[PDB]
Design a protein around this ligand. Structure first.
Ligand code: NI
Length: 341
């Protein structure tokens, strides 16, 4: 049944709750972003109002075939009224089209639902600065102090410099980047930019990217693999067998692969700096795991919460075990005693 952490009290609303059938008493279904564990259940047969960003609504129409009459896109950073309740959509710094949602309840309570987010100090100057938030529905994906990772900027500088050096040393090297969802487009786009190539990809992935309102996108991507020396493949194909196979397909145009796997966290992060990352190599194939995250690190999460000073926190990730729930509740209490709220 629908978990309580997907329901907004004092409303008929739910967030990211499309796999439970008809939720009794729900008048409006919000979708924070187009990742499968959040949209699970949606299709062309859905007939309730879906409220989302413009970019998520493009993906719902083009990829899932949801009918236009049930897609209700909202502009960001704008007070809107939905079924009698004031709401605002804010940029979540996750994947394209991802939002946080501010609910202003008729009784005076203010609720922030982060969806999935990567906390940033820029959020401290949005419309969130303008009033008090009482209850926080929080993306706790990496809520433990072991989870450190570098800035997205540091990670992209590493990838650009590695790719440019390899291809200038060997103009017959191919660059391959893994994907299984939207997000992390800077990794393959920044590398294609430094190399003077478009990124080549399947027709399915090209269709997906063309929904994302990315500026000048027709100049940066293509379905013609032969004209490209940056290829995108399913994340599943980023291993030695999959890559050896791909290289056979390119008909002796290339004699080396340099591949990137943009993982979330990996335990080489508790020890190793970005400067010190090395690949796994077999023969003429090398694979780099780069820690490019679209979720908050521990410290980023803690700073955002200590700034916001909510009265109550409701975690939305890692909720399925008692040890995980009790650990998170201990960190919330530490943060509150340190900051004095
Ligand atoms: Ni997500």
């Amino acid at each position: 049944t629908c978990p309580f952490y997907k329901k907004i009290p004092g409303t008929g609303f739910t967030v990211d709750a499309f796999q439970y059938g008809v939720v009794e008493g729900c008048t409006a279904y919000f979708l924070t972003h187009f990742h499968s564990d959040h949209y699970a259940g949606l299709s062309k047969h859905f007939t309730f109002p879906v409220y989302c960003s413009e970019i998520t609504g493009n993906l719902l129409k083009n990829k899932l075939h949801v009918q236009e009459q049930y897609i209700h896109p909202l502009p960001l950073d704008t007070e809107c009224i939905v079924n009698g309740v004031k709401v605002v959509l804010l940029d979540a710094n996750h994947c394209p089209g991802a939002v946080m949602i501010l609910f202003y309840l008729p009784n005076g309570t203010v609720i922030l639902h982060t969806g999935d987010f990567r906390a940033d100090p820029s959020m401290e100057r949005s419309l969130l600065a303008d009033q008090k938030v009482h209850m926080l529905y929080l993306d706790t994906t990496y809520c433990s102090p072991e989870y450190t990772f570098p800035s997205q900027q540091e990670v992209i500088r590493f990838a650009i410099n590695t790719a440019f050096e390899a291809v200038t040393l060997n103009p017959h090297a191919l660059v391959v980047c893994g994907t299984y969802s939207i997000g992390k487009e800077k990794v393959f786009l920044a590398i294609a930019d430094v190399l003077g190539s478009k990124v080549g990809m399947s027709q399915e992935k090209y269709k997906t990217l063309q929904c994302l309102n990315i500026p000048e996108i027709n100049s940066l991507i293509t379905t013609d693999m032969c004209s490209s020396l940056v290829h995108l493949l399913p994340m599943m194909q980023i291993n030695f067998k999959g890559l050896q196979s791909h290289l056979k397909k390119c008909g002796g145009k290339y004699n080396q692969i340099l591949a990137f796997r943009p993982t979330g966290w990996t335990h080489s992060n508790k020890f190793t700096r970005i400067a010190d990352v090395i690949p796994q190599t077999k023969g003429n194939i090398s694979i780099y795991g780069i820690p490019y995250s679209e979720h908050s690190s521990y410290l980023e999460m803690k700073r955002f919460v200590q700034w916001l000073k909510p009265q109550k926190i409701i975690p939305t990730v890692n909720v399925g075990t008692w040890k995980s729930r009790s650990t998170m509740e201990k960190y919330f209490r530490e943060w509150k005693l340190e900051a004095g709220y």
